[PDB]
């Protein structure tokens, strides 16, 4: 006797397991963006899919019907806040045409490398999970943050971080102590 | 007219016909006759402990002669004798007699022209140790 804590899966494993084409596509996709599981890809494929379903289910209904209007506009403006859907494509028929990379391109991981705070994408990984990289007043340490558009123009280093400001890290002051003590001697 | 009633007030004939016709499916018949609870040696469970009755040197000829190092095991819950494969083991230094053995399913179809039969079970555990771990020299076997 509680309420039963609801919960759900997030991804979905491919239907054909060994398919030299899908295999590769996936690998290059992990490569552009430095993902670690294929699972990271699947998660995207899956959200995408739920959106394509909502999309169609709206599409089959009459234009100027309250529901298609309401949920349509919502789905649209939601897709826009994260800048997955461009400003000009603001009509359902494009949200179908959406593909995976359009989602993979809004990760904090990605935007860190495309706002040039990192040297390579992998660098951006490390830098994120290292508690270095803030979005405004918040630190964020998940590579999958999914940057909204109005939060693009705030991403910087953490006021906590060595690069952001503050004091040097543990290694730095370790070597500072080593050289200072070795010279005092 | 494709030989089935197609009328709007015809449901009963349709669904009844379907029920009488589902008895040609195999699994359906197994599932409503409780064949699993009445006959199947496992009693409708994914596994069964048994005690090795006798070490069997069956010989299954065509097209490939298996010097079948298999076992007669008797399941504890049914007192029901069964034959079972003991995989990956060349010498059978792992499985002796009077040994408790956890069995699972195993899908070897038997063949006709060489009188090779289909055992349906593989040893998964002996004396509480996993056949695999023994075979990997990962875990050792308590011998009693």
């Amino acid at each position: 006797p509680r309420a039963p804590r609801t919960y759900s899966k997030t991804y979905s494993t491919p239907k054909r397991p060994y398919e030299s084409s899908r295999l590769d596509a996936e690998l290059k996709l992990a490569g552009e963006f430095g993902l670690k599981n294929k699972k990271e890809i699947y998660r995207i494929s899956f959200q995408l899919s739920k959106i394509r379903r909502a999309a169609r289910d709206l599409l089959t209904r009459d234009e100027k019907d309250p529901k298609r209007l309401f949920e349509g506009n919502a789905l649209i403006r939601r897709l826009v806040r994260v800048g997955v859907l461009s400003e000009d494509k603001k009509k359902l028929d494009y949200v179908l045409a959406l593909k995976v990379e359009d989602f993979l391109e809004r990760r904090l991981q990605t935007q860190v490398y495309k706002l040039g705070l990192a040297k390579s994408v992998h660098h951006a990984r490390v830098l994120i999970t290292q508690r270095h990289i803030a979005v405004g007043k918040q630190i964020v340490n998940i590579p999958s943050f999914m940057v909204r558009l109005d939060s693009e123009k705030h991403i910087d280093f953490a006021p906590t971080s060595p690069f952001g400001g503050a004091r040097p890290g543990r290694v730095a002051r370790r070597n500072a102590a080593r050289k200072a003590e070795a010279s005092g001697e | 007219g494709k030989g089935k009633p197609r009328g709007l007030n015809s449901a009963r004939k349709l669904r009844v016909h379907r029920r009488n016709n589902r008895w040609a499916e195999n699994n359906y018949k197994k599932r409503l006759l409780g064949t699993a609870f009445k006959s199947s040696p496992f009693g409708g469970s994914s596994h069964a402990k048994g005690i090795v009755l006798e070490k069997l040197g069956i010989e299954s000829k065509q097209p490939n002669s298996a010097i079948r190092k298999c076992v007669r095991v008797q399941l504890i819950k049914n007192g029901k004798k069964v034959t079972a494969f003991v995989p990956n083991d060349g010498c059978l230094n792992f499985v002796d007699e009077n040994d408790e053995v956890l069995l699972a399913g195993f899908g070897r179809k038997g063949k006709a022209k060489g009188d090779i039969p289909g055992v349906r079970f593989k040893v998964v555990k002996v004396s509480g140790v996993s056949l695999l771990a023994l075979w990997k020299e990962k875990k050792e076997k308590p011998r009693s």
Binding site: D24, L27, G31, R125 | -
Partner: protein, 48 residues
């Protein structure tokens, strides 16, 4: 086989990187540094 009691954590050839890193390795094992052998993409060859 037998790792002795000293599994108490608190108080050979090069290794392969794990996780993300490993994938990176593969991405360059197959696409940045392509190895075209005999008109095909050969994976795991000995002497040829």
């Amino acid at each position: 086989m037998a790792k002795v009691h000293g599994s108490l954590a608190r108080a050979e050839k090069p290794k392969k990187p794990k996780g993300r890193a490993y994938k990176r390795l593969l991405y360059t094992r197959r696409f940045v540094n392509v190895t075209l052998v005999n008109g095909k993409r050969r994976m795991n060859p000995g002497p040829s």
